[PDB]
Amino acid sequence: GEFLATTLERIEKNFVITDPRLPDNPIIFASDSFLQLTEYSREEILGRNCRFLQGPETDRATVRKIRDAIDNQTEVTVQLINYTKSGKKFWNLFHLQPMRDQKGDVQYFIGVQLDGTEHVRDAAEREGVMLIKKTAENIDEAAKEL
Ligand SMILES: Cc1cc2nc3c(=O)[nH]c(=O)nc-3n(C[C@H](O)[C@H](O)[C@H](O)COP(=O)(O)O)c2cc1C
Ligand SMILES: [Ca+2]
Ligand SMILES: [Ca+2]
Ligand SMILES: [Cl-]
Ligand SMILES: [Cl-]
């Protein structure tokens, strides 16, 4: 289809990269795993703000925590309900962090999504956060020279 995956997007992890310089801080890279989870083609995702994954059962208090993290250029880890193109529900253990350039200025935001069947706690939450934080650090390396 349109927008053949870059090597970055073939990394075998669920992530997106946004560019805050573009209108509504939209997705510029989306991994193949993200595509498969959400059911959008890449051409349907690019240039859109990620909020299209939200729907009726998404907790708006949780969404505001993400908005505040982006505004304060800082990391956050939350869990929220998201929906596929066909309106299918999933829990999203989500981690955001900025990617900084060699002057320390925010160049991109990196988002890592761990989909699940339920809100997680205790060991499942800890193991999930371990995985998405390690992934985010990996994408910080992978995205630095884009
Ligand atoms: C890198 C990145 C990835 C994001 N991934 C998702 C996502 O997977 N699911 C989601 O519901 N929102 C996601 N968001 C959050 C929304 O894009 C948006 O920031 C949020 O809805 C708060 O802003 P708003 O109040 O303008 O909607 C992501 C944001 C960024 C910067
Ligand atoms: Ca999973
Ligand atoms: Ca799932
Ligand atoms: Cl949360
Ligand atoms: Cl659990």
From TrEMBL:
<feature type="binding site">
    <location>
        <position position="67"/>
    </location>
    <ligand>
        <name>FMN</name>
    </ligand>
</feature>
<comment type="function">
    <text>Protein kinase that acts as a blue light photoreceptor in a signal-transduction pathway for phototropic responses. Regulates a wide range of physiological activities in plants that maximize the efficiency of photosynthesis, such as chloroplast relocations, stomata opening, and leaf expansion.</text>
</comment>
<feature type="binding site">
    <location>
        <position position="115"/>
    </location>
    <ligand>
        <name>Ca(2+) 3</name>
    </ligand>
</feature>
<feature type="domain" description="PAC">
    <location>
        <begin position="74"/>
        <end position="128"/>
    </location>
</feature>
<feature type="binding site">
    <location>
        <position position="113"/>
    </location>
    <ligand>
        <name>FMN</name>
    </ligand>
</feature>
<feature type="binding site">
    <location>
        <position position="50"/>
    </location>
    <ligand>
        <name>FMN</name>
    </ligand>
</feature>
<feature type="binding site">
    <location>
        <position position="92"/>
    </location>
    <ligand>
        <name>FMN</name>
    </ligand>
</feature>
<feature type="binding site">
    <location>
        <position position="54"/>
    </location>
    <ligand>
        <name>FMN</name>
    </ligand>
</feature>
<feature type="binding site">
    <location>
        <position position="43"/>
    </location>
    <ligand>
        <name>Ca(2+) 1</name>
    </ligand>
</feature>
<comment type="similarity">
    <text>Belongs to the protein kinase superfamily. AGC Ser/Thr protein kinase family.</text>
</comment>
<feature type="binding site">
    <location>
        <position position="51"/>
    </location>
    <ligand>
        <name>FMN</name>
    </ligand>
</feature>
<feature type="binding site">
    <location>
        <position position="49"/>
    </location>
    <ligand>
        <name>FMN</name>
    </ligand>
</feature>
<feature type="binding site">
    <location>
        <position position="105"/>
    </location>
    <ligand>
        <name>Ca(2+) 2</name>
    </ligand>
</feature>
<feature type="binding site">
    <location>
        <position position="46"/>
    </location>
    <ligand>
        <name>Ca(2+) 1</name>
    </ligand>
</feature>
<feature type="binding site">
    <location>
        <position position="82"/>
    </location>
    <ligand>
        <name>FMN</name>
    </ligand>
</feature>
<feature type="domain" description="PAS">
    <location>
        <begin position="4"/>
        <end position="73"/>
    </location>
</feature>
<protein>
    <recommendedName>
        <fullName>non-specific serine/threonine protein kinase</fullName>
    </recommendedName>
</protein>
